[PDB]
Design a protein around this ligand. Sequence first.
Ligand SMILES: NC(=O)C1=CN([C@@H]2O[C@H](COP(=O)(O)OP(=O)(O)OC[C@H]3O[C@@H](n4cnc5c(N)ncnc54)[C@H](O)[C@@H]3O)[C@@H](O)[C@H]2O)C=CC1
Ligand code: NA
Length: 404
Amino acid sequence: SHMLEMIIKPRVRGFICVTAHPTGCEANVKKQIDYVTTEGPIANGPKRVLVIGASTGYGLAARITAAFGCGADTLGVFFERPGEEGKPGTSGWYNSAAFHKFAAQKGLYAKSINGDAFSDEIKQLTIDAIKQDLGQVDQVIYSLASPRRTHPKTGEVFNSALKPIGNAVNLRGLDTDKEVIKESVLQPATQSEIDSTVAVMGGEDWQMWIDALLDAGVLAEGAQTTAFTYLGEKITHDIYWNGSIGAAKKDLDQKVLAIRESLAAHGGGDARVSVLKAVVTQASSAIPMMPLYLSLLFKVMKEKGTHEGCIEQVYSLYKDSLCGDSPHMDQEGRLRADYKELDPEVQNQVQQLWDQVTNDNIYQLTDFVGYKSEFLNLFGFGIDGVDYDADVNPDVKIPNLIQG
Ligand SMILES: NC(=O)C1=CN([C@@H]2O[C@H](COP(=O)(O)OP(=O)(O)OC[C@H]3O[C@@H](n4cnc5c(N)ncnc54)[C@H](O)[C@@H]3O)[C@@H](O)[C@H]2O)C=CC1
Ligand code: NA
């Protein structure tokens, strides 16, 4: 009778929210779109863009930036769960439904492919879509965050590890359920754990993608590809940059060589690793220390007027560096968009606060309030203008969605 609709509220445990709100996710996507259109157009951008990991976080922001900033037709790949009666879909599903809605309103092409981007099947479906619709693509954004990867050949399942390397580490953090500041000791990764992490979050699959598009002739001349990375403040180095996930990110710096080699022989193509700031996403919230680190960083950067989320960061990456006349390069040939997080004065303040925070001063020393708000926003909760009291049909459909 009324069974087709429901009132959807957050159900949160740690860094996991098992519900998502379709109306709220739509409004969140609209907010990011309106940011881009308010900042204004970006000149000399790609007009045909493939985003791998296009449904949430930085990849969603890249899709929105490319489409509503550069005016691009966009093809997205992601791995999300559709809604069904009584069972809300994932936020990325609802985000992507909204993206298709708003793109079509603006007369922009938007097609998506839902499935495992690590697989040959999904690469071929993507190839088929480009051939049918666009001819070629000018830019490929590589923005996957995953705990696992099934090798497309051997069928071996690799699982990522988020551990330090060498020595065990005493890592402080904020338990967001209990609101306590506490520490735990993380054991170092074994060689197998490191290899598995490089296999998942390293650059092999990115390479596989560019080669497959190349072989099929659906990569255009003067095209560009970038994969997102994080270097972070020195305080994050034990768990991130110099940890197992860092070994994977370091591999991007090496794969950006052979991939760039393949592309540069193809009409003068290129590849870069783009370094971005820490933001609240499904991925970051799951990394040890990150909820505490983000709570502090948010506070410090807000004090300086430099706080940004996904859309602000990616908009500036496109405008300043991917398409801009004065790009921000480092000594490694990485594109850097993260310098405001890495400023020595910011690092110093974050470090001082890191060593002062307790159960009783969390709200005086940090922006845990902001962290919590942004975390809920990911899932479509706490958004302006959304009536959370209203029943909603969780079964939200997407036109031009190819299910793998
Ligand atoms: N979150 C952060 O602070 C930062 C993240 N980055 C990097 O940006 C990239 C994206 O991260 P986030 O935006 O944080 O993650 P996210 O969790 O918001 O998004 C992950 C995306 O990958 C997709 N995905 C995951 N597995 C897939 C699969 N097997 N097949 C197809 N799609 C799949 C998801 O659908 C989603 O679109 C990552 O490389 C991450 O390391 C870089 C700087 C900092
Ligand atoms: Na992403």
